Amino acid sequence: AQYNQVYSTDAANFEHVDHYLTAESWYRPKYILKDGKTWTQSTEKDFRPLLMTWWPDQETQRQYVNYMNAQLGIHQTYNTATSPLQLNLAAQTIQTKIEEKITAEKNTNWLRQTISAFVKTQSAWNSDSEKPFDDHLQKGALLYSNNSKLTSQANSNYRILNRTPTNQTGKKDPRYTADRTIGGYEFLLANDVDNSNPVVQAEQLNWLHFLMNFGNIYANDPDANFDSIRVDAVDNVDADLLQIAGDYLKAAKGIHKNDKAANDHLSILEAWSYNDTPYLHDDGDNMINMDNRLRLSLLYSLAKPLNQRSGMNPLITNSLVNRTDDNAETAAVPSYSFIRAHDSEVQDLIRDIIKAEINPNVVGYSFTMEEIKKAFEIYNKDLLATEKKYTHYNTALSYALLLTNKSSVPRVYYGDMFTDDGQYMAHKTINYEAIETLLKARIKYVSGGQAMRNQQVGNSEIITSVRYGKGALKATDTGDRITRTSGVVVIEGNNPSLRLKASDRVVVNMGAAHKNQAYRPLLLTTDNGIKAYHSDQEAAGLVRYTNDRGELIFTAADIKGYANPQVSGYLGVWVPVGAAADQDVRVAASTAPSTDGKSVHQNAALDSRVMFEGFSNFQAFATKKEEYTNVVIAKNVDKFAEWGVTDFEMAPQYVSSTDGSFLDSVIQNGYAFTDRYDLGISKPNKYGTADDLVKAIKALHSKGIKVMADWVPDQMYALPEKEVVTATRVDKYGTPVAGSQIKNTLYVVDGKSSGKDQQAKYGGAFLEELQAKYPELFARKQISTGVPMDPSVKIKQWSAKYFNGTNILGRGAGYVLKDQATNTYFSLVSDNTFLPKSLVNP
Ligand SMILES: [Ca+2]
């Protein structure tokens, strides 16, 4: 009893977390039985495990012997009936065996680990006590208490949950009713940063300013700054951040002054709710959101299996813009449009394949490397099939619409041109040719008003989409020479069974600048795929003409249904003959002052832009310098210019954590990180070193292309230090879970950064200069909080007080040790020390 008791009650003598004890705590006894033979004075070296001498109750002390008796090849176990006098010799005999064996392996590392193992067999100490699970992607979350006496350094006056755009004020906005929900939820993955905390808000701003000045700050090269941002996971953070970022863009860059300034820094949100667009629009169009309705329209009218496909009309009317006749010089609301992204309609399809053909109980997207590579074999083959079971149909049809549509900036996804897996840019998809063709055509032909028509012919239907030519917003505008040699027509059908009757005609009005004119093909579907024409000359054979009225006319000879690996339906695209090799109908943004109170205007100059999402989650890791993405990017900067890419959306560049607790930290895309400022600085990121990054930003600038920084304020992964928090089990809205055991109960999280990383170096480092240069930013009272940001304290080190909570860690409800008698946590704070009766007073 005696020797074992604690050496001294100092914090010094125990391994503790915020002065609390855990099941895995080691400490300094007064003596060590040396080689289980002789009672020698401890030194600051002789640390043992608590569990070696103390148990939270007798039932646990029992298991421990049984378990331990196993390990030490002691051949005796005890069932529930056992006295405690035997439970007490059982552990003393083990204790000798423990020293004897430490002497023998000259170490205790092996113990560290028999201990750690055992701890995990107990309910109070594993994920058993953390049930019931909920539908958080990592199975559950813990909300940290704002007011706990036990964990005062984790207290917060904030932690205001769920203030999405729709719900920013804590009530659902009456203004936006397309989404009838509250438009998002707080807890998405990992450690959830509390973005309602004014100090944290200021820190998000610091980081924004940093990214946007990355060149100057890191390389001293004004030519290497990110030009613009994406706000990630908008519907999972506090929407004040939208005001802050827009306020910034305004103050620092002048985006509200004129279009040229707004388009040099054109920024986007990833905001899934239908409410978010009108919300953004009332906010002043300081950034643009995706057109989610059009995305769904493409997906269901074009990309789904033949039996699940819907009719085509939504391709015209289910959108931010009704494209039946779109003749506005400036659209009501700006947006960007896409059909796939790094996550959307890619990692889903892999999940579909794993869940179907590999591991049926796979959770969320928590995949393994193994499963994935296995998944990819199936997927890649499905890509080449005519009958697809897992992957998109009609990719080229979707791009034809996206790249010819008026009133939205198209975003092309990397993985629709290159293989989603695979070294960067090494392999082309079968659609690369058609997409590149469309991209090139867009620069040269795509300008003017738009008309879309849905026509029931033969046994099915087609839609026709028409751009009138540069300088004709309406069908009746005759324009000038360049109008005449610009414009385009797209014809599409979504049913392989489409047959026209002999008497059918599809009559397309091309616009008044196009009477009696030659047209030639750009893309035509063929039995095996799609044939691309790279020049008039190339398509010399297949010319057709409009008539007196400027109508093209199409017939059964032109239009029928196909099924091949690229087309399930019909695609045809025609362009006028005679465009100068170097014709370009894009249009530069005006310096004329903006006057409608909005920053971004969806006009012809904005339509002239094209966005490129330049990565895939599932890219292979580089084998060598040459294969690093950012290296490869700098080296093909010309292609991007040739495609008319004006905004290059780089992947997040933060060094990835490697915990594997979610997809993002398995394929290391850059959304899972521990250091916000570590852009390939401490070691390379998936995409190269900080220098490769700097070089790729420079390369893209040299072509005049803009580069977007993914701004990811929602969460952080794998913090290095432990902290104790008062936690509660909650669902993703922060509501307490029914039937859980963790309710204002102490928990051990990984919630502290190292205080020695880049964050330590740059955190809050620019606040002072920001307040001098842009006092207006700090004057705003943020919506959710009612108060201004708080730059008066810098964040050099993240700790739990800056977080809402975390995903569940499997440590258990009882990990932090409590005297079950008094039901009170043990503590090592000095004026109030409380230890287990046996270790201090035996
Ligand atoms: Ca959040």
Q: Which residues lie below 8 Å from residue 566, measured CB to CB, with a gap of 6+? A: 394, 395, 396, 430, 431, 434, 525, 529, 530
In terms of domains, do 33 and 83 share one? Answer: yes
Q: Do β-strands 611-613 and 647-649 pair in parallel, antiparallel, or remain unpaired? A: parallel
Cα–Cα distance, 498 to 461 (Å, whole number): 7
How remote is the CA of residue 807 from the centroid of ligand 1, in Å?
Answer: 11
In terms of domains, do 370 and 519 share one? Answer: yes
CATH number of the domain encompassing residue 529 = 3.20.20.470
Cα–Cα distance, 124 to 835 (Å, whole number): 20
Which pair of structure tokens corresponds to residue 649? Answer: 């959306």
How remote is the CA of residue 9 from the centroid of ligand 1, in Å?
Answer: 40
Is residue 339 within 8 Å of residue 298, measured between CB atoms?
Answer: yes
Which pair of structure tokens corresponds to residue 373? Answer: 């590579």
Amino acid, res. 443: I
How remote is the CA of residue 236 from the centroid of ligand 1, in Å?
Answer: 4
Cα–Cα distance, 706 to 411 (Å, whole number): 14
Q: Is 38 exposed, middle or buried (0-12, 13-18, 19+ CB in 10 A)?
A: exposed
- SS3 percent helix, strand, coil of the chain, rounded to 5, is 30, 20, 50
In terms of domains, do 497 and 559 share one? Answer: yes
Cα–Cα distance, 292 to 319 (Å, whole number): 8
Handedness of CA 768, 211, 155, 823 (dihedral sign): negative
Cα–Cα distance, 688 to 622 (Å, whole number): 9
Is residue 588 within 8 Å of residue 535, measured between CB atoms?
Answer: no
Handedness of CA 535, 537, 538, 539 (dihedral sign): positive
Cα–Cα distance, 19 to 812 (Å, whole number): 19
Write out the H or E segment, with its range, that includes residue 120.
Answer: helix 111-121
Distances, alpha carbon 341 to alpha carbons 109, 184, 284, in Å: 46, 20, 26
In terms of domains, do 365 and 491 share one? Answer: yes
Per DSSP, 128 falls in state G
**Three-state DSSP state, 95:** helix
Cα–Cα distance, 647 to 291 (Å, whole number): 17
Cα–Cα distance, 108 to 110 (Å, whole number): 5
How remote is the CA of residue 184 from the centroid of ligand 1, in Å?
Answer: 9
In terms of domains, do 265 and 333 share one? Answer: no
Tell me which residue range forms the domain holding 116. Answer: 1-140+817-841
Q: Do β-strands 506-509 and 551-554 pair in parallel, antiparallel, or remain unpaired? A: antiparallel
Cα–Cα distance, 188 to 136 (Å, whole number): 7
In terms of domains, do 152 and 266 share one? Answer: yes
Handedness of CA 395, 397, 400, 402 (dihedral sign): negative
Amino acid, res. 313: N
Which pair of structure tokens corresponds to residue 554? Answer: 């199409």
How remote is the CA of residue 191 from the centroid of ligand 1, in Å?
Answer: 8
- Centre a 10 Å sphere on the Cβ of residue 376 and count the other Cβ atoms it contains: 17
Q: Look at the block and give the residue holding tokens 């780089």.
A: 650
Q: Where are the beta strands (DSSP E) in 113-207?
A: 141-144, 191-193
Residue finishing a domain among 653, 686, 707: 707
The CA dihedral of 73, 78, 82, 87, to the nearest 10 degrees, is 20
Long-range Cβ contacts of 827-830 (<8 Å, 24+ apart): 827/19, 827/20, 828/9, 828/10, 828/11, 828/14, 828/16, 828/19, 828/20, 828/21, 829/11, 829/19, 830/11
| Per-position DSSP letters for 646-714, written without gaps between them | -EEEPPP-SPB----SSGGGTTT-SSSBS-TT-SS-SS-BTTB-HHHHHHHHHHHHHTT-EEEEEE--S
Is residue 54 within 8 Å of residue 48, measured between CB atoms?
Answer: no
**Three-state DSSP state, 628:** coil
Which pair of structure tokens corresponds to residue 240? Answer: 């004040």
How many Å is the Cα radius of gyration of the chain?
32
Beta bridge partners of residue 562, listed in sequence order = 569
Which pair of structure tokens corresponds to residue 355? Answer: 């869940």
Runs of H (alpha helix) within 320-463: 347-357, 369-384, 395-402, 432-445
The CA dihedral of 533, 536, 538, 539, to the nearest 10 degrees, is 70
Cα–Cα distance, 10 to 14 (Å, whole number): 8
| Per-position DSSP letters for 633-656, written without gaps between them | HHHTHHHHHHHT--EEEPPP-SPB
Beta bridge partners of residue 523, listed in sequence order = 532, 573
Cα–Cα distance, 269 to 283 (Å, whole number): 13
Q: Which residues does the chain break after (C to N > 2.5 Å)?
A: none
CATH number of the domain encompassing residue 250 = 3.20.20.80
How was this one solved? Answer: X-ray
How remote is the CA of residue 194 from the centroid of ligand 1, in Å?
Answer: 7
Cα–Cα distance, 312 to 188 (Å, whole number): 34
In terms of domains, do 42 and 57 share one? Answer: yes
Alpha carbons within 13 angstroms on the beta-carbon side of residue 258 total 7
Cα–Cα distance, 692 to 708 (Å, whole number): 16
How remote is the CA of residue 188 from the centroid of ligand 1, in Å?
Answer: 6
Is residue 136 within 8 Å of residue 187, measured between CB atoms?
Answer: yes
How remote is the CA of residue 234 from the centroid of ligand 1, in Å?
Answer: 9
Cα–Cα distance, 837 to 4 (Å, whole number): 12
Q: Do β-strands 544-545 and 518-525 pair in parallel, antiparallel, or remain unpaired? A: antiparallel
Beta bridge partners of residue 551, listed in sequence order = 509
Residue finishing a domain among 659, 675, 707: 707
Taking alpha carbons only, the member of 808, 727, 784, 790 closest to residue 162 is 784
Cα–Cα distance, 101 to 112 (Å, whole number): 13
**Three-state DSSP state, 545:** strand
Which pair of structure tokens corresponds to residue 167? Answer: 């719900």
- Centre a 10 Å sphere on the Cβ of residue 580 and count the other Cβ atoms it contains: 10
Amino acid, res. 156: S
Which pair of structure tokens corresponds to residue 171? Answer: 């009530």
Cα–Cα distance, 300 to 564 (Å, whole number): 18
In terms of domains, do 41 and 153 share one? Answer: no
Is residue 499 within 8 Å of residue 558, measured between CB atoms?
Answer: no
Cα–Cα distance, 492 to 54 (Å, whole number): 75
Amino acid, res. 296: L
How remote is the CA of residue 218 from the centroid of ligand 1, in Å?
Answer: 29
Distances, alpha carbon 624 to alpha carbons 536, 629, 684, 687, in Å: 42, 11, 12, 11
Cα–Cα distance, 247 to 254 (Å, whole number): 10
- Centre a 10 Å sphere on the Cβ of residue 830 and count the other Cβ atoms it contains: 10
Number of compact structural domains in the chain = 3
In terms of domains, do 639 and 511 share one? Answer: yes
Cα–Cα distance, 93 to 651 (Å, whole number): 58
How remote is the CA of residue 164 from the centroid of ligand 1, in Å?
Answer: 9
Alpha carbons within 13 angstroms on the beta-carbon side of residue 31 total 13
Count H helices, E strands: the chain?
23, 31
Cα–Cα distance, 411 to 528 (Å, whole number): 27
Q: State CA 280 to chain mean position distance.
A: 20
Cα–Cα distance, 233 to 235 (Å, whole number): 6
Q: Is 760 exposed, middle or buried (0-12, 13-18, 19+ CB in 10 A)?
A: middle
Burial 502-536 (b: 16+ CB within 10 A, else e): eeeebebbbbbbbbebebbbbbbbeeebbbbbeeb
- Centre a 10 Å sphere on the Cβ of residue 328 and count the other Cβ atoms it contains: 15
Per DSSP, 632 falls in state H
How remote is the CA of residue 177 from the centroid of ligand 1, in Å?
Answer: 23
Cα–Cα distance, 122 to 128 (Å, whole number): 9
How remote is the CA of residue 384 from the centroid of ligand 1, in Å?
Answer: 39
Q: Do β-strands 611-613 and 530-532 pair in parallel, antiparallel, or remain unpaired? A: unpaired
Per DSSP, 145 falls in state P
In terms of domains, do 678 and 719 share one? Answer: no
How remote is the CA of residue 708 from the centroid of ligand 1, in Å?
Answer: 22
Which pair of structure tokens corresponds to residue 817? Answer: 């040790």
Distance linking the first and last C-alpha atoms of the chain: 6
How remote is the CA of residue 271 from the centroid of ligand 1, in Å?
Answer: 13
How remote is the CA of residue 292 from the centroid of ligand 1, in Å?
Answer: 21
Which pair of structure tokens corresponds to residue 838? Answer: 């046996």
- Centre a 10 Å sphere on the Cβ of residue 177 and count the other Cβ atoms it contains: 12
Q: Look at the block and give the residue holding tokens 């629009």.
A: 281
In terms of domains, do 720 and 691 share one? Answer: no
Amino acid, res. 570: Y
How remote is the CA of residue 484 from the centroid of ligand 1, in Å?
Answer: 52
Taking alpha carbons only, the member of 791, 715, 784, 766 closest to residue 157 is 784
Q: Is 719 exposed, middle or buried (0-12, 13-18, 19+ CB in 10 A)?
A: buried
Is residue 576 within 8 Å of residue 611, measured between CB atoms?
Answer: no
Q: Which residues lie below 8 Å from residue 109, measured CB to CB, with a gap of 6+? A: none
Per DSSP, 10 falls in state S
- Centre a 10 Å sphere on the Cβ of residue 585 and count the other Cβ atoms it contains: 23
Write out the H or E segment, with its range, that includes residue 116.
Answer: helix 111-121
Which pair of structure tokens corresponds to residue 94? Answer: 């083990």
The CA dihedral of 13, 17, 23, 29, to the nearest 10 degrees, is 0
Taking alpha carbons only, the member of 106, 221, 234 closest to residue 166 is 234
Cα–Cα distance, 611 to 604 (Å, whole number): 15
Residue finishing a domain among 670, 688, 707: 707
What phi-psi label fits residue 817: left (phi over 0), alpha (psi between -120 and 50 degrees) or beta?
beta
Phi, psi of 541 (to 5 degrees): -65, -20
Which pair of structure tokens corresponds to residue 611? Answer: 């966005």
Q: This structure's resolution (angstroms)?
A: 3.1
Distances, alpha carbon 294 to alpha carbons 320, 321, 546, 613, in Å: 7, 9, 31, 18
Amino acid, res. 103: T
Burial 589-604 (b: 16+ CB within 10 A, else e): beeeebeeebbbbbbb
Cα–Cα distance, 545 to 557 (Å, whole number): 15
Handedness of CA 543, 547, 549, 554 (dihedral sign): negative
**Three-state DSSP state, 434:** helix
Cα–Cα distance, 749 to 145 (Å, whole number): 13
Taking alpha carbons only, the member of 637, 698, 688 closest to residue 221 is 698
Distances, alpha carbon 213 to alpha carbons 150, 546, 714, 772, in Å: 41, 53, 21, 17
Cis amide bond preceding 305, omega within 30: no
Alpha carbons within 13 angstroms on the beta-carbon side of residue 592 total 7
How remote is the CA of residue 715 from the centroid of ligand 1, in Å?
Answer: 7
Which pair of structure tokens corresponds to residue 327? Answer: 């003749």
In terms of domains, do 790 and 752 share one? Answer: yes
How remote is the CA of residue 734 from the centroid of ligand 1, in Å?
Answer: 10
Q: Do β-strands 31-33 and 824-825 pair in parallel, antiparallel, or remain unpaired? A: unpaired
Which pair of structure tokens corresponds to residue 416? Answer: 């629709």
| Per-position DSSP letters for 380-417, written without gaps between them | HHHHH-SS-SSS-S-HHHHHHHHTT-SSSEEEEEGGGT
Cα–Cα distance, 674 to 709 (Å, whole number): 17
